UniProtKB/Swiss-Prot annotation, chain B:
Highest taxon of source: Bacteria
SUPFAM superfamilies in alphabetical order: cAMP-binding domain-like (SSF51206), Winged helix' DNA-binding domain (SSF46785)
The keyword GTP-binding belongs to this UniProt entry's keyword annotation: no
Function, in words: Required for full expression of proteins subject to ammonium repression. Transcriptional activator of genes subject to nitrogen control.
Keywords, alphabetical: Activator, DNA-binding, Transcription, Transcription regulation
PROSITE patterns named in the record: CNMP_BINDING_3 (PS50042), HTH_CRP_1 (PS00042), HTH_CRP_2 (PS51063)
Protein name: Global nitrogen regulator
Record-listed a nucleoside 3',5'-cyclic phosphate binding positions: 4-123
Molecular-function annotations in GO: DNA binding; DNA-binding transcription factor activity
Keyword DNA-binding listed: yes
């Protein structure tokens, strides 16, 4: 998160927020990749959709993330191949690519803000490769929950509460598992008093302690 | 592509900038080193991994030619420390630049941010393709999907399909697909018996890679 906000704000009279209700699509596979986006409030899910209807989550984007990054690849005018959806209610800015290109020229300083933003995305995607590299599905779940604690967490007496409504199917789609398995594993974590769930919001106790097993 | 442009830009980031050689298996940066440089991989493959206290390494990226990496330096500079291990997976040729020399070249050569932004966008997309590979629930499909990425990244034409132009130990494969070595040995054995790949001195050839990728639609 940073003053990506300030600079996106001034790319327009001012650039206007676009709102998306929970579950609405920001872009569809097959759409032209002609815009870059700054997520301002909420979380955006990027997924791969297969012919069977099955959907796999490739990114759960946090506030102040740059995305739609395919659009920066020129000279290809190609099409979106992921589906971007508002995972919660969402506020974002969106900019046609030509505008971006030009703003970078007439203010060199803002190159540096974008490079930092894309660097941060690379690192966050690599953290999700680590989560998925685990063979114990439990460790995989715990690792994913710690990333969410960091990305979407708010303080609690007990620990950190993930400020997101999480369905078990949504967790399954993000950690390469199934609803049934996720339910069993969340159940085990609850019995052991490592987490608690209230209204589909997972609170994890002692996330710093719990993250030790991940050397 | 942006590849040509990254090369030129980096090459002309002089006192003209000199290629550095790394022998196979040599470390480019260790966890705990200060994050003071950005890198451009020119020839070869660089393995990025996480190292746990047991000494076990997990692969987080097998970087292909013309990749920008060391990207943590673009946030924090020397201020923060590396937390991944970068290793020359083959013999490697690369350019590297102190972070300050980068930032300065960007202000002086405005349009050059573009080329860097393309490079980093490309890294995001490749890492996401690796999340897809790893999302697969059965190890077999994980393996095949990985091998197809490698065909694209490091493949050369063979008269049967594509040869992945890298030596791939069973251990190395296991560290990349979240499996055990034993599982990889058996799966590579199954792919050979089904006449889907051939292996010679650790170089894997996959027959008809386009047809095989259709199963992943
Ligand atoms: O990670 C991202 O920024 C979204 C991927 C993308 O740009 C696209 O699908 O067009
Ligand atoms: O993904 C990369 O470019 C390498 C990650 C990095 O910059 C670092 O670990 O310092």
């Amino acid at each position: 998160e940073n003053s990506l906000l300030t600079m996106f704000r001034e790319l327009g009279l001012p650039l206007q927020i676009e709102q998306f209700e929970r579950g609405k699509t920001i872009f569809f596979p097959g759409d032209p990749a002609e815009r870059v986006y700054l997520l301002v409030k909420g979380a955006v899910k990027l997924s791969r959709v297969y012919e069977s209807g099955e959907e796999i989550t490739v990114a759960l984007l946090r506030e102040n993330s740059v995305f739609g990054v395919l659009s920066l690849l020129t000279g290809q005018r190609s099409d979106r191949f992921y589906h971007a959806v508002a995972f919660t209610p969402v506020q974002l800015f969106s900019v046609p690519i030509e505008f971006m290109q030009k703003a970078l020229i007439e203010r060199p300083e803002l190159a540096n803000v974008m490079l930092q933003g894309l660097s941060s995305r690379i690192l966050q995607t690599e953290m999700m490769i680590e989560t998925l590299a685990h063979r114990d599905m439990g460790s995989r779940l715990v690792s994913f929950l710690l990333i969410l604690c960091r990305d979407f967490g708010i303080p609690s007496p007990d620990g950190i509460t993930i400020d997101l409504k999480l369905s078990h199917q949504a967790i399954a789609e993000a950690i390469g598992s199934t609803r049934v398995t996720v339910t069993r594993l969340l159940g085990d974590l609850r019995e052991s008093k490592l987490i608690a769930i209230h209204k589909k919001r997972i609170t994890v106790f002692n996330p710093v302690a719990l993250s030790q097993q991940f050397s």
